[PDB]
Amino acid sequence: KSTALNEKYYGLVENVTIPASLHEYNGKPYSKVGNAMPIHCATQEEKELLSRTTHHYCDLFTDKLFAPLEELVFVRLDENKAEKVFLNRHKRLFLTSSDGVVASWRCAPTLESLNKFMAGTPLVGRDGRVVSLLTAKHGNHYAVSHLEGDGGYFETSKPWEIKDMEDGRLYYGNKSFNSRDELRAYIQNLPPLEVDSSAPPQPILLRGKNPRIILVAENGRQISHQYISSNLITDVEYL
Amino acid sequence: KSTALNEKYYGLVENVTIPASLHEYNGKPYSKVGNAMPIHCATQEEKELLSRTTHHYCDLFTDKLFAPLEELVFVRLDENKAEKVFLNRHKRLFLTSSDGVVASWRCAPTLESLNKFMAGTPLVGRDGRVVSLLTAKHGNHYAVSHLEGDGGYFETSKPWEIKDMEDGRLYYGNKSFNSRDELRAYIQNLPPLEVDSSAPPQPILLRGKNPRIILVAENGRQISHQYISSNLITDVEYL
Numbered sequence: 391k392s393t394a395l396n397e398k399y400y401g402l403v404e405n406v407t408i409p410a411s412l413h414e415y416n417g418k419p420y421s422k423v424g425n426a427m428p429i430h431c432a433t434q435e436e437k438e439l440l441s442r443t444t445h446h447y448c449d450l451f452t453d454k455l456f457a458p459l460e461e462l463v464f465v466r467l468d469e470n471k472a473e474k475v476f477l478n479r480h481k482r483l484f485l486t487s488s489d490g491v492v493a494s495w496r497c498a499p500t501l502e503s504l505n506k507f508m509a510g511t512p513l514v515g516r517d518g519r520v521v522s523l524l525t526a527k528h529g530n531h532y533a534v535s536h537l538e539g540d541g542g543y544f545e546t547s548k549p550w551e552i553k554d555m556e557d558g559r560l561y562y563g564n565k566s567f568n569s570r571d572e573l574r575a576y577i578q579n580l581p582p583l584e585v586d587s588s589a590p591p592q593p594i595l596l597r598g599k600n601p602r603i604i605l606v607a608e609n610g611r612q613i614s615h616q617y618i619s620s621n622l623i624t625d626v627e628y629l
Numbered sequence: 630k631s632t633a634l635n636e637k638y639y640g641l642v643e644n645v646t647i648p649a650s651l652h653e654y655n656g657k658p659y660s661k662v663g664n665a666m667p668i669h670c671a672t673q674e675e676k677e678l679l680s681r682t683t684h685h686y687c688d689l690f691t692d693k694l695f696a697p698l699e700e701l702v703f704v705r706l707d708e709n710k711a712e713k714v715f716l717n718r719h720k721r722l723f724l725t726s727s728d729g730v731v732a733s734w735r736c737a738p739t740l741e742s743l744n745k746f747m748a749g750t751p752l753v754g755r756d757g758r759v760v761s762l763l764t765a766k767h768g769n770h771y772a773v774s775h776l777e778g779d780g781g782y783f784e785t786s787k788p789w790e791i792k793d794m795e796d797g798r799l800y801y802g803n804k805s806f807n808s809r810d811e812l813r814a815y816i817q818n819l820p821p822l823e824v825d826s827s828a829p830p831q832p833i834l835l836r837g838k839n840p841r842i843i844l845v846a847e848n849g850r851q852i853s854h855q856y857i858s859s860n861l862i863t864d865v866e867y868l
Contacts, residue, residue, distance in 0.1 A: 582825065584824060585822060586822070613830070614853060
């Protein structure tokens with residue numbers, strides 16, 4: 391029934407009827423809308439089928455595009471009520487996902503709520519069409535995964551590795567180093583970059599003051615290295 | 630002598646002495662500071678050596694880190710004069726470069742000047758240490774290539790391909806399509822992703838209202854696909 395786990399609803403509550411069904415994975419509840427659901431709530435066998443028809447959204451499976459994301463959304467509380475909230479495009483949460491085909495990332499806008507929503511809780515726009523489902527949060531800030539904003543994906547079956555950086559340290563591939571000399575010595579002695587179906591690329595998120603996304607080959611050679619914003623919230627809880 | 634090509638200097642001109650040497654490539658002038666220079670001003674034989682010791686800056690070779698970038702810089706006009714300007718972190722130019730080792734990009738902050746500076750013109754901070762050299766410009770806005778702002782690089786010997794998008798088209802790898810069905814059919818029938826030293830990855834910048842960076846394999850399979858901001862100025866002139 392309820393997608394909000396708290397009994398007393400907070401915020402601006404309006405009478406909006408938004409369908410959802412309730413499910414469970416790994417001891418945590420989640421909701422679906424038809425076949426649409428968060429990727430992190432899917433078993434591997436589910437991902438292997440849902441990945442073949444979905445549109446590419448970070449941490450969401452859906453066979454049809456979601457409706458457009460505007461200035462506000464309604465977040466489902468229960469069968470008959472929803473919370474009306476503004477979208478915040480200034481405060482962004484960094485989402486990651488993998489479905490066995492693509493490893494996606496997104497600098498997602500957020501909404502702030504004192505309610506405790508489960509994964510997969512649907513959000514609708516003014517006309518009642520589903521615009522997104524909830525995925526991850528930090529504190530009271532919930533990401534809104536959609537097709538706007540900075541984001542991307544890597545073509546690989548490997549899941550993300552999520553790591554933390556140290557100030558002043560240097561990073562290449564899977565490794566970190568005290569100095570450029572140590573880093574360059576390592577690079578020089580690696581075999582040449584190679585990628586194939588038995589050697590899929592590994593995506594890495596490095597969190598910290600100067601955060602990075604790295605794509606590294608099975609043999610240790612870098613494929614890509616990117617600097618992302620220190621303002622992104624990368625300490626996130628997948629619901 | 631002069632790194633500004635106009636005879637009458639505009640702006641706030643101060644007595645600051647900044648060393649530089651004058652050079653020419655393909656009939657266009659450029660300046661160096663010691664061994665430091667813009668990548669786009671180097672011959673292939675020069676790149677092949679300079680690439681082996683340089684630090685990673687988009688479109689700049691330097692064996693030593695540049696000094697920190699703060700709120701303002703002085704841009705060399707001639708042997709004894711420089712223009713005092715503010716750094717603008719709101720208006721960003723998108724830079725690309727390749728040195729045969731890495732294909733880099735950067736969302737660079739800018740400075741505005743009515744003077745016409747050549748490529749490689751040095752910029753210094755309050756203490757006179759070189760902070761960057763000029764690379765590209767759009768209008769009166771010059772990029773400041775440095776270690777700040779979003780950016781990255783791909784490990785490859787290929788140079789960038791720079792393309793313009795068309796309304797209504799979908800993009801995968803090297804190709805564009807009028808419908809999702811045709812795009813998905815194309816992907817399904819490519820050989821599996823493969824990369825090696827005789828099949829290096831190809832970086833592509835797609836410019837337009839919904840711009841992209843795509844890294845594609847020699848055989849046409851994607852390695853990565855990312856969405857970047859339509860506010861980035863991607864129409865730039867390498868000086």
